[PDB]
Design a protein around this nucleic acid. Structure first.
Ligand SMILES: *Cc1c(COP(=O)(O)O)cnc(C)c1O
Ligand SMILES: *Cc1c(COP(=O)(O)O)cnc(C)c1O
Ligand SMILES: *Cc1c(COP(=O)(O)O)cnc(C)c1O
Ligand SMILES: *Cc1c(COP(=O)(O)O)cnc(C)c1O
Lengths: 444, 444, 443, 443
RNA sequence: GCCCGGAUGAUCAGUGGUCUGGGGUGCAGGACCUGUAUGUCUCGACAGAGUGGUUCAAUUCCACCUUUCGGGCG
């Protein structure tokens, strides 16, 4: 009778390996774990009649370490190719191919249907941008500059410098309450400097309001006309239909060479992995081969486990819920602000992040804006970013005026809040309740 | 009575946090897990009265993912500093400090007593060398070349190219059976090229016989005299008293700016992490700050769990056992080779790796050397590297003659075998038994 | 710092103070923190420990030790399964707490007047046995147990294992329901004599068309003749109607203990039970009658489950069981219409339903026997098929009309039930495959 | 490909073929692969499943489900704890295999002629009870159980729970050892009469200075008078001398069953036991006497442990228990010398030792009572201290000289033991803290 | 479970990711398991589903035409 039992799991598994797409409904844990166990025993470190006389054998001293990784020890890839099948680890190599294939499937469902290729890379989004820039150097050996429409996030700014290039900060234009791409200045800069001296244009979709996603269609056309590479920082934009649509359109009407996303921000897994994806299949393969040596299999295993358990239906559900929570948070901030003579900034073009003003707090008199930020933290509100006026800040030599606000002089101090994937109404209701108590105390 | 119970564990824990060294004897699992649980609940994602309105909150969709990481989700560091305390994750930040502090303790016990500083970085050894080279670019903006005494390992070679420099391959000199540093050629090259055009000298300790660790004392003096940075690839050399001693001596008599080690090869944990360590405390801090964004906490958690369970006594034990297994493997290969009219190459200066000759196999007639390698693999011998004559190979544009042998014309084909940490007699006895059967079949 | 560990301690300190279920379930982090701190209270988990005894709690396999959260010593002392074990302070605390939580749930479920109870790691059958074994010393001339019939081999055999002779009282057909023959019960105590009766042994939960025994009338019979009353409540914790029935019987008459399965009511593995009652002293006597130490595994399962669910967690599950019962009923009604069958009118049973199989031929086509075999291979579990004229021998006693709880029920029938944790998918998949099963069995 | 999964299948296919322990332990990867494939054979783990029953194996907490490897249905059918459960094919297989492995170990340990045995998830006390309960139906006029005294509350109470009256036979002081009063046993069967005796109930393993009962002489007494013989072998599987003693008694006389703890012999959590015997039919009858389904938890613990250890794993543990026994002995000898005490000469006991405490005053300084309390706070477990004149009441019967197994042993004494899994550290830490304990108690 | 207006126009003769006529309308391993199986972004707008593999994208949307209906006019 030990037949028809397996035969239902074997089929969900054979179906996964042949067509490479997410299951529509999530696997039961019993299936997932049977599968992980079937892969792990395919690696040579887990063979029964095995001897190892090499210096890298996947030996594990602690049993707590081996059990928590489902006995996957050899990482992904070979030394010369992170995407190559590892003969010492047939099972881990298969894992890598399936995970990458699932991630590709989700990029499509999420919005970029024309994606040609992608891979999971066990560094975060900053360092994966850096690996993009490091790959471009070889192609454009005269190139010295990366043109970068400003965003006050220390990681993607430093990514250009760790790669050893010079970022050219293109300030944004203030349209209403929104901060947007200065397409005039960007094109003036590629001409002042010269296409040959530009490594790439580096744009951002996901960001804190009142910045909004960059004008990707326009920027991609500039890039196609001047023969300049386009790199998109899409850090948490997989969860946003609008963001994924910009990338999609930017590639249709113009040029996008790669776009980069975080794993934790989009798939709800621990920090430390990212996806590099693109439309030229061979260029994405090239970034892959620029990675020296083997890498951790952890972020891949986390992603594989998460997508198989959720299914594409579980994803669609979370994505729909995120949109709904954005409306509900938006309306709640509208209601709460009004009571304090503040307003929700008009930022329609930003689908994930919102801002509430703080004009009624005097920072130079009572240091109230900072104080608000501090109080929110000690009331265990997380992610509530306060942004004061006129903060100078130096990051890797370069000085920012009005830092955290994405421009030298925004009209007012404000407070961020987001609806990111996984949010529950309790988050918003507790946020609103705690912000209310906080403002009340500051203004008393 | 819920007092004196905790009070024995609390003390092992308070002792760990105050003096920062390994326990001498390993903790019981009950203590380790109590500690991990005490840290995890210190992170805000695990707070009970928590709401999150940000885009990175450490949300975990699958319970299998959260439980297997002991609920550590936020990774290590902040965006501007991978070594900074994370206010959203006080517990993960503490983990990072303890792990780094334990690793420092083990570097000392293992041999480099004068180490000033180190950190765990969740990329492998190749990419961590790259992060070293990326840090040096800023200091030596005229520098274009890395001088590199040859070793046929695709990862550390590519590391120089991914960083965007040009490796200058310095061939080795054949002394007896051993391949060693050409100190003549290295110093001739820094003069032909010019100190200002050298980014660093890149040397290797651990490697496959018949190469041997590089002459670090001499190379460090060359580096101190010409004001050139010295980077040591010490990939699996923590386990070797002799290797760690070279690094130690090289820093005493000369200059070493950083040395890099793998986690899996030395601490028996999954692939995907490395340690960057050095003698100038501020320079090591600088490599740290060149890493853009946050990173995975996984390889650190693996290391913390492994060292607390083993203790420094468990390490000393494994290190002693490795030496003994090297003798036993050495003697066994001596015995087996003799029976086939082969010999164990005289490579006294290499403490981890051995080689047996294969002169009695005709590769151009019967393709026997390749065939041997193939048969060893299908008999589930792992790490048994076969090295034929005259294999050409291209790696990132650069062509290698006699690849895998570290020089253009080694006298013979040979077979590697190692005694790396964690080896058991069964490995050697099964290796010998299976190699014997293999040679017999090839020569019949 | 550790101003964050405090709110975890609050939930734990509140559980130890009053010993009631939390209204909202604990997060896993809190639970596992609590469990890991109970386990280091046990002497076998002490750091400075040497053991020169024969029961030291040594564990050979790490897999085994980890899966029990390092609880090895079981519950109890060898002389009292309800005593603190000095060598296992943590496991003793675990056992006190589990019993306290389980007491709260019995009250919450409908028996608010329950005085005491304990978890025992045998199943319901063998716990009923422990009740009888305890009654033997109080009634040493007793030989008989009066038992309103129910065709279930475990409660029946529990009387023979204890060493008494079960006196089977057939049921009365009252409409479509099978109910307690109260007159034949009372006649049996008059014929055999009260002193010769160990107890009356009745049953709340059961398969339709049997319904809960009339506990009030039996509790009064037992009060008058001075006979103890033991109620088999195997899976009636999930039914407020069964629990209120037990509460009412205790109010107007006499109920000495009532026994419940852990796995049918709390959704944990098979193996443990609850013995409860209204007389603090007698429930203590059944506990003290247990020889030796016992597994802590079913306590730890219940404790993890209640702390994870909470009051509200439990209330919700109990409310949805009702809704699934209506839904399963309407669905059986509708499906039965289309096959010229009907839903037996058994309104007194709140858990189990029955549907007629008159139109299926069992003596010429053997379709009734085959409908069972069919529902199985289509992976329907728990849908039991009851034929006509099934003779069966359990422990020497031979039943006519087995599975039907009487010798000649009017028709063959099919059971289905709404047991706690049932989802709308369970009903819908069942209706579907039954429909394909009947349709296919008419060819 | 999957030419690597094959060698795992080989180990599993070999276990199912012959059902013996592997000589070398399985790797965890093999074990967990085996267990995860047994668990998907259970209907509650089927993918296309709907459940309309009242026992469907629903699990509310993921923590609970995972820690039992998704085994929820327990072992057995409600009518036979030794039957295949169609709703749980995997758990039935788990149960067959565990029993087969455990049979192999009984043989390996010294009773090569054992015919049958089964794991039962009650402890040794309540399993002894199940034996008596099974004998009641075969001997319905019996009232008494003849019992060579041993001061341990669980085996003593097991006779009263079953409903029989224990007839205590005091022991003979033979040297320093307490042994079976064979003449007083035989006189008691002649006074009460064989037909009134349910069985003789003897004991192999015990605390020094009691030693294993004379099973051969009692097995012959039982053969002649036609009385059943039940042996309490609670922790004697680990002693080849106890097992050979049981093997010899069966050879020359009559032994009906012998009972063993799982936790004392196999280093798993408290809770389960083995009932074994030489008559295939009678061991089957004790199994069939169990009402209902039972926990699978202690089976799964034993199965994980034996497959991890193997034959050799077990042999080694048993060999080291001997070596620790010599070592503990020499160490007690040496330490006792320095305190003007001695090691009671009890050569017939292979597990437990005793050391005199003559020089400690218990009636003027109360040092004997206090040495116990002291060894505890210094975290010595299992070192039990036996005073003089300890009166005690268990279940109405009052013992004089409790813990000493007679009314007037010559002196107070202290027990220590070499039980399986003991390490040289255990002895050395004990010798040390005893030495600091005595030294401190003379002031 | 005029396993084997309106099979799955030529792989029920639900729907954007050059997958022609569970008539008419608006087997194997003017139980009338005109495996209109021939969503030579914001009005061997963006995507041979008749004229996965051998508009960026259309099921052998618009106009593993032909046909047809309805309205185990006359
Ligand atoms: C998260 C994020 C990044 C990358 O951050 P890492 O810490 O490197 O993952 C870059 N830019 C923005 C706007 C982000 O939100
Ligand atoms: C392991 C190793 C490296 C680094 O390899 P990664 O795969 O990047 O960890 C470099 N050089 C040598 C000689 C090695 O053995
Ligand atoms: C350990 C032991 C038992 C076991 O009793 P439990 O019911 O398992 O507590 C019984 N009798 C004796 C003599 C023992 O040593
Ligand atoms: C479920 C049930 C039992 C429980 O019997 P076990 O001994 O747990 O197998 C007993 N009686 C009835 C009527 C039941 O429905």
């Amino acid at each position: 009778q030990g037949c028809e039992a397996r035969r239902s799991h074997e089929h969900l598994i054979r179906l996964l390996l042949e067509k490479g797409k997410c299951p529509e409904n999530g696997w039961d844990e019993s299936t997932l774990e049977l599968f992980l166990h079937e892969l792990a025993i395919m690696d040579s470190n887990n063979f029964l009649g095995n001897c190892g006389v090499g210096e890298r054998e996947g030996r594990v001293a602690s049993a707590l370490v081996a059990r928590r990784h489902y006995r996957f020890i050899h990482g992904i890839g070979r030394s010369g190719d992170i995407s190559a099948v590892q003969p010492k680890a047939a099972g881990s190599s298969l894992l890598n191919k399936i995970t990458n294939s699932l991630v590709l499937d989700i990029i499509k469902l999420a919005g970029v249907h024309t994606v040609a290729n992608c891979f999971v890379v066990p560094m975060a989004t900053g360092m994966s941008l850096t690996l993009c820039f490091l790959t471009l150097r070889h192609k454009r050996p005269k190139a010295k500059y990366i043109i970068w429409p400003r965003i006050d996030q220390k990681s993607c700014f430093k990514s250009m410098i760790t790669a050893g290039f010079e970022p050219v900060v293109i300030e944004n234009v203030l349209e209403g309450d929104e901060l947007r791409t200065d397409l005039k200045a960007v094109e003036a800069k590629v001409q002042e400097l010269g296409p040959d001296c530009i490594l790439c244009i580096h744009s951002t979709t996901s960001c804190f309001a009142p910045r909004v996603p960059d004008r990707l269609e326009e920027l991609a056309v500039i890039c196609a006309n001047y023969d300049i590479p386009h790199i998109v920082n899409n850090a948490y934009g997989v969860q946003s239909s609008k963001c994924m649509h910009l990338i999609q359109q930017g590639a249709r009407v113009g040029r996008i060479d790669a776009f980069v996303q975080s794993l934790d921000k989009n798939f709800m897994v621990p920090v430390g992995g990212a996806i590099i994806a693109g439309f030229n299949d061979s260029f994405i393969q090239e970034i892959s081969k620029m990675y020296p040596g083997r890498a951790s299999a952890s972020p891949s295993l986390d992603v594989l486990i998460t997508l198989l358990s959720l299914g594409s239906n579980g994803c669609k559900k979370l994505l729909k819920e995120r949109k709904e929570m954005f409306s509900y948070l938006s309306n709640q901030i509208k209601k709460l602000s009004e009571a304090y003579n503040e307003r929700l900034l008009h930022t329609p073009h930003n689908p994930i992040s919102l801002a509430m003003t703080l004009k009624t707090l005097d920072e130079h008199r009572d240091k109230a804006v900072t104080q608000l930020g501090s109080m929110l933290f000690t009331r265990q509100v997380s992610g509530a970013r306060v942004v004061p006026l006129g903060s100078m800040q130096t990051v890797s030599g370069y000085t920012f005026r009005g830092f955290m606000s994405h421009t030298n002089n925004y009209p007012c101090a404000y407070l961020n809040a987001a609806s990111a994937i996984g949010m529950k109404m309790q988050d918003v209701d507790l946020f609103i309740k705690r912000l209310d108590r906080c403002l009340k105390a500051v203004r008393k």
